[PDB]
Structure formats: structure tokens, C-alpha cells
Design a protein around this ligand. Structure first.
Ligand SMILES: [Zn+2]
Length: 133
């Protein structure tokens, strides 16, 4: 899994600043494929759920191009070549009202590097918020 969580949200549901941590991404040994392999263009980004449908906002930042990577293990490898964990920062949501259970910062895949990201979604295995106990 990919573990991330918001540690504070300030503002209002539709105009919020999230302080976040992407803590770790465990090794990928399940043969999961990259959902955007073979798209014309695909990026892995740090982004938030922007809509009640869980689609992406304007990314906090883009990490790498991934459309040539067939597997999620390869996506993880490229992320690690570009960035160390943990990833921390703040990002701001201005848009649809979201409750705490609808708020999430994590690693998204998406066709666009920036701007609102309706075709972006969390990578498979993303556990946003409280992990399992
Ligand atoms: Zn947003």
C-alpha cells in the first residue's frame, strides 16, 4: 500500500489548507499494473481529492512521467528515483465542499501535469487517512 494522511485541515470545506504526509510506499509484489500505461501522457503527482467523486485537483507537484511504465512496481521505482519519503507539505483545496472523510492527499496518476485533474485518481493501493489497526 501507499500510506498518506492529512494531519490538519484549516479553513472551510470548500476552501481548505491541508497539511499532509505521504509516509511510505511498500514494495509492490502483487503484479499490479500501472492504470495509465500506454496513455499518450501520464504523470504521477501529489494531489488531493477535489470532488465528491475522488478525482484530482491542482497537484501539489508532479513527480514523474509514467505512461511508459507497465507495472506499479516500476512506477514506485521511478518515484523513488525522483523523491525520498516521507513527502510533506501543504496544499490548498478551493472547490466542492468536502467533509473530513472526503479529504485526501496522496499519489495520483493523471494525464495532465497541472490544473484541475478530473481524469486523475489515486494510484491503486492508496490508503488515505487512518491506516488499519
Ligand atoms: Zn481541490
Amino acid at each position: 500500500s501507499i500510506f498518506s494522511y492529512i494531519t490538519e485541515s484549516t479553513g472551510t470545506p470548500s476552501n481548505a489548507t491541508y497539511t499532509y504526509v505521504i509516509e511510505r510506499w511498500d514494495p509492490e509484489t502483487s503484479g499490479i499494473l500501472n492504470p495509465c500505461y500506454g496513455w499518450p501522457v501520464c504523470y504521477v503527482t501529489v494531489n488531493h481529492k477535489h470532488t465528491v467523486n475522488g478525482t484530482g485537483g491542482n497537484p501539489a507537484f508532479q513527480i514523474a512521467r509514467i505512461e511508459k511504465l507497465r507495472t506499479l512496481a516500476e512506477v514506485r521505482d521511478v518515484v523513488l528515483k525522483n523523491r525520498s519519503f516521507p513527502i510533506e507539505g501543504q496544499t490548498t483545496h478551493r472547490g466542492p465542499s468536502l467533509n473530513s472523510n472526503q479529504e485526501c492527499v496522496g499519489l495520483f496518476y493523471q494525464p495532465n501535469s497541472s490544473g484541475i485533474s478530473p481524469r486523475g485518481k489515486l494510484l491503486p493501493g492508496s490508503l488515505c487517512g487512518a491506516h488499519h489497526h
